[PDB]
Amino acid sequence: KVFERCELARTLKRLGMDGYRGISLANWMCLAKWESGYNTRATNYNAGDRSTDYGIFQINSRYWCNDGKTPGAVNACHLSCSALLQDNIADAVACAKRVVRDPQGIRAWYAWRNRCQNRDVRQYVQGCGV
């Protein structure tokens, strides 16, 4: 599923993402935008280490979910990477929450540090009624 901007904003809000561990919705939106373009089907194979980034938040198989094919990885979210490719983003949100509970928080995502950190992200939630 490829979400419309505000559709995603509200979806994330209903899933308890607004201010989760201090992260505003606008930040989550900016991350999903640059990670997948709001596409839950997005996948990126990393030939270097044989891991794959899955879904709307582009969560990596090396540490966060299990896909079997990544040589010896871990599964911190305790989910099949398949769960991160569903139209329903509840499982991806739960895993995204798990990622931010770590020290770095949302800084875990390089794209957030580069494209969202200390930026005017208001435009991600404007008009969405969130």
From Swiss-Prot:
Listed InterPro entries: Glyco_hydro_22, Glyco_hydro_22_CS, Glyco_hydro_22_lys, Lysozyme-like_dom_sf
UniProt keyword annotations, A-Z: Amyloid, Amyloidosis, Antimicrobial, Bacteriolytic enzyme, Disease variant, Disulfide bond, Glycosidase, Hydrolase, Secreted, Signal
Enzyme Commission code: 3.2.1.17
Disulfide bonds: C6-C128, C30-C116, C65-C81, C77-C95
GO BP: any one term: defense response to bacterium
Active site (catalytic residues): E35, D53
Its biological purpose: Lysozymes have primarily a bacteriolytic function; those in tissues and body fluids are associated with the monocyte-macrophage system and enhance the activity of immunoagents.
Protein name as annotated: Lysozyme C
